[PDB]
């Protein structure tokens, strides 16, 4: 039995068990400060409806805040297959302001891009369950969706925002609701008569600290190393059937950046990062006589079939020199997240990390773009020569080509996630870097 | 022009002229200790 | 083969940005330092040298 | 118990480590100190008619497909820990 | 039926005599050299 | 893994092979040697060369030392391929080596044949055959230049190069006897071939030119060499009967430390025939068919390894009436002795008995000194000649103690002995120390 292995000890084990330091069989847990978490509903100012801008100030109920969930009650304006993450689409953007200053901001597309890159497995599935209809629900069905926020303090207790030490500055969230949400109030470009307006609610998780921890937070200045999202929109060089478009995009990013992320999309259809095609799930009616490659199967808008992605290859150039050798779009789509995240990224979404572990909170190598005069993302596109309505052409094609319908992917969204420092001192908040 | 038998014939002293910036080393390689051969003595006189 | 030099592309290329121009302008003048590289060219070259670390590894 | 994933049929694992999927050593079997290590395997009876779902799916614990006799190759792996010693511009392993 | 190309790369080498060869190996050298910078662009399309 | 995995597997049992190492295999330092050059110089042959003539040559003083000597001949075929057998070797009936008038050695055509059969081998032996015979099925009238190297002690190794340089007062000569007849060249069996050409001949000597220091040493110092000599006694055989086993005791008039004895039985009519003939492939003219004549050999295939056609049943050598070794079968002398002592293959009918560990080499390795044996005798027992040679079954299916009825034609026996003498050179003169 096991005793026969214990006796198999040699010189080699001096690097494993000789002069031992630790064991595994007597875990000693750390004692910790007394705390409790309460989920509290916030008041939303302005008027909730499609296309409206509303806002909330976070009530000072507890000492620190972490999770924030924005809840929407939506109804189906059509049958199963007509919606795609509609609660995510609806929350067009969220802006975080402390004391009148912008700290950060997220966009519906970012939530989709973020999810595509950083969530995974059952986390991603449960996420979909909280933002969409996933059990083949029918028209008229009503559901409450929960959209978690992804600001730095919504990701870890370690960055809980110290409302307690922000005594003079209010913390507010401004939310932009989309004018239209697919399968809820519009179907493609067509309004859905009788569609209901959303019911909105914002929930914040407030941590109550006991007296000694609470007092310490109130009396001390604090610095929190946090992440921020930088984002600008660009026009995608139109890819073409006859030429490989190329484009030099100047990146107006600053600060120590963990990673860049981007996607190409059809701005008409939320989450469409790939070309439409007559292959299963790639278009409305794919596989039958009614198939069209002008409209997606909304319920299956995102795919993994890179043949429908537009990007051929890309590189990042810094101050005129390459940062790395040019790699194919599939490197950014599949390998980068393999190497650094461990999840699976949908076709049309790309990542390039400057960090060992971009998905974490601990900095692990960054690209400080404030020290770079010229940061350029150089993209080469595939040729859109494949007849999207013919599976033989769609599925039997080559490395450098894509669907004729990939020319509809005219929008380009480039994101960068970076570090900054949030200073909380004498009751006021703001950032260390501009 | 000189008869071949009275021409020099020594090639360019390249190995005396290159002057690599750093001296050569002894290119040691290894597979490590014979772990099954540690503390095992086969040299025993029958007593 | 047996090449003992680094060869990791980080040997002599001053890969900063135009911030290096501001740095070299932070050692000579205030606004238009041009007269300093025009005259002190040898001083501007002595101000451009690389770091050095050596490791012998003698014979047996 | 040891990894947390799902292993497909026909692939087997036996760990000597508490956490074999990680880097930190957590219990090892040092075969350099074992004069005779042996893996003992017993195979199933290949009596199930592979072409008949009733037989393929309704069978017992100790039997398999008649087509299982085509699995004539065996691959045995062992992942172990050694030390890579690097110094004075050169390196190699601590143990052979 | 088109044939594939045959390719070969030739380098013309300079062999220095003893004194010059020694100096090149031992002395530091600095050359002012040329580089090509290049990017491709889409041309605004002209029209009638 | 790899080669280092062998080096690391080191222990007590390696000490006897690699501990306190003395040598390596990977650093050869060649010896510096005296500078020299070798020239092929044609000698003048005195006397008329032709069939049956005796001619001679004096080796000129062109170089300092001599080694190889090659006698060239040009012969024309008197019949078609298959009618000759080593005809250049057969033509050179004998060669006599003399220094200052003293006979040093003397070789015979049959010795060359026996020597070759015993000591040359593989491709060397073939290359030799290519220089003495027609081996590419040449036809009647074909002309060919043959090269017959001499095999005297100084003609086999540089180590025994004869110091002409230290023989300032003595002529060194070679006398050559040419055979009156050569099969398939000027005679066919007992008949002469009318119109056959007389042979041409040329003697070539390879002379070594020394540097000054080596040349001076040789010219003035005394030299002593171990040299080889061939002793030879030809005699009538106790020709086997078709009814019984003939036997014979042959007094061997041999002397000197003998490296080895060798012998063969033969049909003196047919050069190189050491065995009986039979109607089996290669064993006779027309063998294998109705037209086969078992009294006429396939000359081009005269030799054979088929011991059935040999006549020695068994033999022993006596010294002063005492058995030297237990009686062994003829096949023991034919196959094992040369296996052990030479490493080549010996043809049937040729027998070897060594007194030396390695008789094929220069370095002495055990000898029988016959100068001290008052009565040296070879004792032979022959096979019974009861087998009908014209019936392949009779030949191929028979027993150990019998041979062909045509084996009664092996009326001659040639016994050779190779021994060591001492050649001395001093003050310009040379000769052999022992009689």
From Swiss-Prot, chain B:
Induction description: Expressed in the late phase of the viral replicative cycle.
Subcellular location: Virion
Segments forming a coiled coil: none
Function: One of the minor capsid proteins that constitute a network internal to the major capsid proteins and outside the lipid membrane. The minor capsid proteins glue and stabilize the capsomers.
Assembly with partners or alone: Interacts with the major capsid protein.
Protein name stated in the entry: Minor capsid protein P5
Organism: Paramecium bursaria Chlorella virus 1
Name of the encoding gene: A526R
Location of this fragment in the whole protein: 99 to 145 of 146
From Swiss-Prot, chain C:
Organism from which the protein derives: Paramecium bursaria Chlorella virus 1
Induction line: Expressed in the late phase of the viral replicative cycle.
Domain of life: Viruses
Interval of the full protein contained in this chain: 6 to 65 of 181
Function in brief: One of the minor capsid proteins that constitute a network internal to the major capsid proteins and outside the lipid membrane. The minor capsid proteins glue and stabilize the capsomers.
Subunit-structure text: Interacts with the major capsid protein.
Protein name as catalogued: Minor capsid protein P4
Protein location: Virion
Gene this protein is translated from: A572R
From Swiss-Prot, chain E:
Induction: Expressed in the late phase of the viral replicative cycle.
Superkingdom of origin: Viruses
Modification note: Myristoylated at the C-terminus. Glycosylated; highly branched oligosaccharides. The pattern of glycosylation sites are unusual.
Compartments (UniProt record): Virion
Sequence similarity: Belongs to the NCLDV major capsid protein family.
Described function: Major capsid protein self-assembles to form an icosahedral capsid with a pseudo T=169 symmetry, about 190 nm in diameter, and consisting of 1680 major capsid proteins trimers. The capsid consists in 5040 copies of the major capsid protein (hexamers), 60 copies of the penton protein (pentamers) and 1800 minor capsid proteins of different types. The minor capsid proteins form a hexagonal network below the outer capsid shell, stabilizing the capsid by binding neighboring capsomers together.
Official protein name in the record: Major capsid protein
Taxonomic source organism: Paramecium bursaria Chlorella virus 1
Biological classification of the source: Viruses, Varidnaviria, Bamfordvirae, Nucleocytoviricota, Megaviricetes
